[PDB]
Design a protein around this motif. Structure first.
Motif: not given
Lengths: 61, 66, 68, 66
Positions: B44, B46-47, B50-51, B53-55, B57-58, B60-62, B64, C46, D43
């Motif tokens: 849990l 570790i999960l 990862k969440i 880390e995904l946030t 990532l999102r 960083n995409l936003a 860009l 996104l 990404l």
């Protein structure tokens, strides 16, 4: 005889309670395991969905 | 009753051993479940990682895209 | 004659430049239209990614609830 | 003749300038698009790693279950 019969009833009562606790504990463990199996299945679905997104991004590139 | 006394004393000794074993059975079961729960708590946590880390990532995409 | 030759030279060059400019502006405009469409497609991705992170968060919350 | 040569020479300076401007805009646009693409590819690689890490988590969970 009176004393041993009272103790017999006492021991039977204690054993019945212990049977009940063991049954309840296994019942709970089974349900836990069922709930956890579905979480694993939902997770598996999220992984597949993220992989579809990865694929769509790779494609756009 | 000499007969009855004999019989109930034998029964009670059996019952004592059944109860001891039952108690041991429950403790074993509960210990196993505890170990199961602790190992899942690690999963849990570790999960959680990862969440986050995904946030990131999102985010960083936003950035860009914005 | 020198003036006549210069005039002709510069007319030829201007016509060449007009063609090169037309070509380049068309290239730039197409390139930018394509980039806009690419960015729009990424925007949808996104939004989709955000939904998946939200659903992961719910899953995590449910695991935490199970573990009491 | 004099007016016409002056006219065509002024026009030529105009066009040459427009060409310089277009060369410069094309260079800048191409640079921004390449950087944007490279940054996106980052990404995508990070997303791939997260999917990998999540698949590891799923595998640990499955093993704890089985």
């Amino acid at each position: 005889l009176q004393e041993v019969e009272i103790r017999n009833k006492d021991l039977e009562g204690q054993l019945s309670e212990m049977e009940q606790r063991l049954e309840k504990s296994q019942s709970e463990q089974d349900a836990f395991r069922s709930n956890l199996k579905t979480l694993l299945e939902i997770l598996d679905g999220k992984i597949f969905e993220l992989t579809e997104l990865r694929d769509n991004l790779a494609k756009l590139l």
